[PDB]
Scaffold this active site. Structure first.
Site, mmCIF file in Angstrom:
data_model
loop_
_atom_site.group_PDB
_atom_site.id
_atom_site.type_symbol
_atom_site.label_atom_id
_atom_site.label_comp_id
_atom_site.label_asym_id
_atom_site.label_seq_id
_atom_site.Cartn_x
_atom_site.Cartn_y
_atom_site.Cartn_z
ATOM 1 N N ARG A 133 0.281 -0.823 0.098
ATOM 2 C CA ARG A 133 -0.201 -0.347 -0.379
ATOM 3 C C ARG A 133 0.798 1.067 -0.396
ATOM 4 O O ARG A 133 2.099 1.334 0.659
ATOM 5 C CB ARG A 133 -1.699 -0.047 0.892
ATOM 6 C CG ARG A 133 -2.062 0.796 0.710
ATOM 7 C CD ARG A 133 -3.195 1.206 2.573
ATOM 8 N NE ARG A 133 -4.033 -0.660 2.552
ATOM 9 C CZ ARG A 133 -4.837 -0.779 1.752
ATOM 10 N NH1 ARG A 133 -5.201 -0.518 0.102
ATOM 11 N NH2 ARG A 133 -5.236 -2.349 2.035
ATOM 12 N N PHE B 43 -0.779 6.075 -3.121
ATOM 13 C CA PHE B 43 -0.983 6.673 -5.108
ATOM 14 C C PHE B 43 -1.295 5.055 -5.342
ATOM 15 O O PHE B 43 -2.087 5.319 -6.287
ATOM 16 C CB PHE B 43 -0.192 7.176 -5.537
ATOM 17 C CG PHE B 43 0.677 8.680 -5.060
ATOM 18 C CD1 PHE B 43 0.691 9.440 -3.868
ATOM 19 C CD2 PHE B 43 0.010 9.755 -6.264
ATOM 20 C CE1 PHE B 43 1.262 9.891 -3.588
ATOM 21 C CE2 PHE B 43 0.624 11.218 -5.658
ATOM 22 C CZ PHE B 43 1.172 11.253 -4.275
ATOM 23 N N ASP C 270 16.093 6.005 -1.624
ATOM 24 C CA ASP C 270 15.045 6.482 -1.218
ATOM 25 C C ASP C 270 15.508 5.464 -0.403
ATOM 26 O O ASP C 270 14.772 4.953 0.687
ATOM 27 C CB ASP C 270 13.642 6.379 -1.819
ATOM 28 C CG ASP C 270 12.707 6.531 -0.950
ATOM 29 O OD1 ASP C 270 13.011 7.237 0.136
ATOM 30 O OD2 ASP C 270 11.128 7.074 -1.655
#
Ligand SMILES: CC1=C(C(=O)Nc2ccc3[nH]ncc3c2)[C@H](c2ccc(F)c(C(=O)NCc3nccc4ccccc34)c2)NC(=O)N1
Ligand SMILES: [Mg+2]
EC number: 2.7.11.15
Lengths: 618, 339, 62
Positions: A171, A174, A289
């Site tokens: 999840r 977006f 990230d």
């Protein structure tokens, strides 16, 4: 319904021109594709005794490069030598340069067996296989089979309906990720579904179109340590990615359940992750990230890096913008207008690893939930490290968490290689890391928004297939089976016509193949005929009959692509206001018939014009 | 200078040759025949249709047996038909699509064809197993093959857009003789009946008379205003008709070395595509580009008949050696036979 | 352009000029002659009825 069906060999006429049109029929281009290699190989071993031994050798050589030790090698290399080089010298049927043959002979008696021992031989086998042997392969009907598989590939259009979707296992803001099987070939995958609506409302069209481009950059090469893409496609509401399936859940979750990791356990994850970075970094991609929630486990415990939305390409322009996750972003990242390359991930690798040992990011102290607190602590403050750590572990983290790029481990001109030879990893053998041989530490178990056609243009060139992936997916499941089932279904019909004579032979026929012309549209009448394009006429026939209709090049005025039932067709405009429409059985067929009919009539019309007997006299 | 004398001489030789002819213009053929009875109206009807070609028909030719004939079509095929019965004795798929002409060797045993392939190909009609082999591919020309006729089973005369015609030994595929001379694509050719002469018509708007054995041009008749699409001997061997793009036919006598008669009317503007005499030479059949064949009285030059039928250009025609019938091909993809 | 071309052409024109021509009236007469002499054996001119005409109402062939 749901399995693959290959087109009929008739398809060879059309595809071979489609490929010849693209310089796609080299030996070099076909050898380098899984399915090509496979078909080519069948050919040589089973059908052409002249080249069998040449490939056998190629392969026996191949396997020798995977062999793990020098005692496994010198053992093998004698056998290989004895069996494929030597024996042939004695009968004088060894067609290879002696510089190649003595380059090997010299090292065997002097016992030095690197994995590249036979590298001048590969080369020369390829010279020997190219062209002439390659020729009899094109003429062979293994190349028929190649065009068949190729037609399937070049006609892939996916919808949500090509996979059975299972549990939601991901999840984000977006969209969500589901696990799923692809019916076609039975393969399990992840399906990421971003919702366009949620995107527009949150203005993130770039940071999603990016994630795709990036997955393109990376998904070749088969990396054990990144979550890669085999396809992307869309529907009007959703973008979709088919990704490697990782159903162990991420580290950010597993951290909380296990609590902190030992150094030894942490070493494992860090190891894989490195290799994962390496792969990215060779393809000129900074991930950015890097953190526990972006590292997932498979069912066995091995891990991979996922979600490359923030990853960008420094191959041309380096980035300056402050885009990563707060707590993991490096100094050079943070300051705007300050550029950075791969350097950035190594810092984050640092922070992430602190986090697996410690509970928190190095800079996230005082349970602080405020950002500007860490912003500043990271840039200003040098880093202090529990004395519970071993010193070689320090040696590593100190190097990684250097605020100076020129002093940071990973950044000093050799990229990842340095990091791997930190003393923290001295116990590891990275061939074994990469074959995933080390046992893993942990083993798991509302809108009112509108969408303008200005936005579907945004997501225009999104559909994609990675060919290398598809061919693998196929190669390792149905390919051998399907070739058999087909081999049977074709061998019935050829044995049975015994209608044998072939109408295109002995003539000046350009191209032939199936297509369905349109009769009465109101009756959804499509006769499917076999067509033959000659330079001046387009004949077609049904069955048990030579062509009894045709259409001449000189009466054709224009050829256009037109949709009928949003199912794209060819529309030919005829001289006497008349119209003629054809649907062909695949994208590349259409493209080729549209080209060849276009070239055909253009020329014939211009040639006829220059002959008094045939020309018209207005 | 050297050329300018040779140009000077050619001019004052054409002027001389013009006068030689004007010296024999004591009478018109029209005058000379002013006394004989008309032929009346000639009504001819369509005894057969030959359907089978899938596209335009470009040329045809009767077998000497007045029964069989060969046709050649945009559909890349030769058909040989039994005219009596409409029976395709042979369909013959060709190796180039661009055929333009065909011929039936007088013997029955070979046919020839050719076109933009620039080759005359001899097809053998009954071999070992009575199959239809190709026997030769007379390559040599450097322009489209426009017409061709067998002398016998060993020799054949072709004509071409390379502005030349040529003689061939079929056996060895050798280009035996070549007839340079024309200054424009050569279009039709016709063999004299004794077969030691033949004439050829071309886009330079001239016809030429050639000696087979000498390989030279005997005579050159001019005076069409445009391309000469077709040509055919008067049966006695002394005169030939030509049909032009300029909407006329023209009879030329060999021996008087000139035009004798023009066949035309104001109503007719479309070009001519083929010609052929009846047996006696009294009737001149011409195929036009308005889909009619017009029949002409040769001796008087009044339009005696029309063979209306086809729906597009009449590309070709011929009368049978016995005199019974007329064949006619068209762009509408049919042949038709008429008494 | 070329000298030998102009030459060959002239030789041709000489050749063509030196032939024995005949009065138009003679050749014309001779044609009309032929046309009578054979109007007897020409089926398109003198209509020979259906029995001898292989096409008309016939069907009896080898
Ligand atoms: C690795 C990971 C998620 C995730 O689970 N992804 C994932 C990928 C491949 C897989 N194979 N097998 C399992 C599996 C799981 C999850 C997740 C799952 C589905 C999502 F749609 C998003 C997501 O939308 N993230 C934000 C985002 N994604 C794409 C474009 C964006 C653009 C702007 C802003 C946010 C954007 C995030 N959340 C997260 O923190 N990281
Ligand atoms: Mg920066």
């Amino acid at each position: 319904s749901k399995k693959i069906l290959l087109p009929e060999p008739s398809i060879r006429s059309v595809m071979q021109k489609y490929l010849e049109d693209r310089g796609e029929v080299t030996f070099e281009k076909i050898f380098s594709q899984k399915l090509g290699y496979l078909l080519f190989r069948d050919f040589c071993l089973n059908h052409l005794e002249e080249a069998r031994p040449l490939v056998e050798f190629y392969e026996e050589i191949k396997k020798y490069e995977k062999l793990e030790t020098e005692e496994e090698r010198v053992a093998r290399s004698r056998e290989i030598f004895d069996s494929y080089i030597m024996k042939e010298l004695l009968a004088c049927s060894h067609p290879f340069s002696k510089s190649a043959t003595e380059h090997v002979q010299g090292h065997l008696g002097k016992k030095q067996v690197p994995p590249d021992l036979f590298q001048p031989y590969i080369e020369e086998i390829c010279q020997n296989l190219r062209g002439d042997v390659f020729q009899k392969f094109i003429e062979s009907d293994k190349f028929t089979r190649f065009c068949q598989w190729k037609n399937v590939e070049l006609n892939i259009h996916l919808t949500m309906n090509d996979f059975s979707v299972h549990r939601i296992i991901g999840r984000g803001g977006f969209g969500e990720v589901y696990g799923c099987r692809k019916a076609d070939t039975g393969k399990m995958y992840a399906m990421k579904c971003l919702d366009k609506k949620r995107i527009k409302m949150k203005q993130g069209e770039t940071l999603a179109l990016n994630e795709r481009i990036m997955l393109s950059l990376v998904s070749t090469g088969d990396c054990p340590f990144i979550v890669c893409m085999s396809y992307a496609f869309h529907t009007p509401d959703k973008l979709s990615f088919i990704l490697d399936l990782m159903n162990g859940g991420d580290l950010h979750y597993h951290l909380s359940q296990h609590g902190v990791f030992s150094e030894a356990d942490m070493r494992f994850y860090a190891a894989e992750i490195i290799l994962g970075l390496e792969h990215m970094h060779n393809r000129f991609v900074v991930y950015r990230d890097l953190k526990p929630a972006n590292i997932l486990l498979d069912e066995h415990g091995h891990v991979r890096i996922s979600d490359l939305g923030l990853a960008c390409d420094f191959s041309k322009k380096k980035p300056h913008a402050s885009v990563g996750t707060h707590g993991y972003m490096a100094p050079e990242v943070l300051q705007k207008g300050v550029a950075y390359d791969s350097s950035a991930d190594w810092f984050s690798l640092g922070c992430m690893l602190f986090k697996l040992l410690r509970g928190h990011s190095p800079f996230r102290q005082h349970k602080t939930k405020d950002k500007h607190e860490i912003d500043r602590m990271t840039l200003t403050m040098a880093v202090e490290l529990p004395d519970s750590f071993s010193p070689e572990l320090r040696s590593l983290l100190e190097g990684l968490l250097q605020r100076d790029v020129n002093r940071r481990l990973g950044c000093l001109g050799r990229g990842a290689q340095e990091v791997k030879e930190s003393p923290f990893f001295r116990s590891l053998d990275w061939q074994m890391v990469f074959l995933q041989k080390y046992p893993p530490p942990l083993i798991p178990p509302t809108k009112g928004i509108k969408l303008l056609d200005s936005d579907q243009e945004l997501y225009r060139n999104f559909p994609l297939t990675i060919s290398e992936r598809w061919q693998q997916e196929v190669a390792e499941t149905v390919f051998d089976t399907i070739n058999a089932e087909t081999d049977r279904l074709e061998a019935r019909k050829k044995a049975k016509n015994k209608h044998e004579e072939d109408y295109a032979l002995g003539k000046d026929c350009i191209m032939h193949g199936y297509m369905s012309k349109m009769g009465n549209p109101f009756l959804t009448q499509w006769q499917r005929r076999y067509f033959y394009l000659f330079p001046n006429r387009l004949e077609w026939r049904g069955e048990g009959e030579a062509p009894q209709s045709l259409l001449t090049m000189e009466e054709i005025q224009s050829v256009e692509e037109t949709q009928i039932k949003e199912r794209k067709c060819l529309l030919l405009k005829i001289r006497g206001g008349k119209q003629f429409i054809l649907q062909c059985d695949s994208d590349p067929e259409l493209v080729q018939w549209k080209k060849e009919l276009r070239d055909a009539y253009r020329e014939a019309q211009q040639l006829v014009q220059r002959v008094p007997k045939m020309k018209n006299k207005p | 200078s050297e050329l300018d004398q040779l140009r000077q001489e050619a001019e004052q030789l054409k002027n001389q040759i013009r006068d030689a002819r004007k010296a024999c213009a004591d009478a018109t053929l029209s005058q000379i025949t002013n006394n004989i009875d008309p032929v009346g109206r000639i009504q001819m009807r369509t005894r057969r249709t030959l359907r089978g070609h899938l596209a335009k028909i470009y040329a045809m030719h009767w077998g000497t047996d007045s029964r069989l004939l060969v046709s050649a079509s945009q559909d890349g095929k030769l058909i040989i038909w039994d005219s009596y019965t409409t029976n395709k004795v042979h369909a013959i798929p060709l190796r180039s699509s661009w055929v333009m002409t065909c011929a039936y060797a007088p013997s029955g045993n070979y046919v020839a064809c050719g076109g933009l392939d620039n080759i005359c190909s001899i097809y053998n009609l009954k071999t070992r197993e009575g199959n239809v082999r190709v026997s030769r591919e007379l390559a040599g020309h450097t322009g489209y093959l426009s017409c061709c006729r067998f002398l016998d089973d060993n020799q054949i005369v072709t004509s071409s857009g390379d502005t030349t015609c040529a003689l061939w030994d079929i056996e060895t595929g050798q280009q035996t003789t070549t007839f340079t001379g024309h200054t424009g694509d050569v279009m039709s050719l016709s063999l004299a009946p004794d077969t030691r002469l033949f004439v050829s018509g071309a886009c330079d708007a001239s016809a030429k008379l050639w000696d087979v054995r000498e390989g030279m041009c005997r005579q050159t008749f001019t005076g069409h205003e445009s391309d000469i699409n077709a040509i055919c001997f008067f049966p006695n061997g002394n005169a030939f008709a030509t049909g032009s793009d300029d909407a006329t036919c023209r009879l030329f006598d060999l021996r008087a070395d000139q035009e004798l008669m023009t066949y035309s009317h104001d109503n007719i503007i479309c070009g001519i595509t083929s010609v052929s005499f009846s047996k006696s030479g009294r009737l001149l059949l011409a195929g036009y580009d308005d889909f009619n064949c017009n029949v002409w009285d040769a001796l008087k030059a009044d339009r005696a008949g029309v063979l209306a039928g086809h729906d597009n250009r009449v590309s070709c025609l011929g009368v049978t050696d016995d005199g019974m019938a007329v064949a006619t091909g068209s762009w509408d993809s049919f042949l038709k036979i008429w008494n | 352009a070329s000298i030998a071309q102009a030459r060959k052409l002239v030789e041709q024109l000489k050749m063509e000029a030196n032939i024995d021509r005949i009065k138009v009236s003679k050749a014309a007469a001779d044609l009309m002659a032929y046309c009578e002499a054979h109007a007897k054996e020409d089926p398109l001119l003198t209509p020979v009825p259906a029995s001898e005409n292989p096409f008309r109402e016939k069907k009896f062939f080898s």
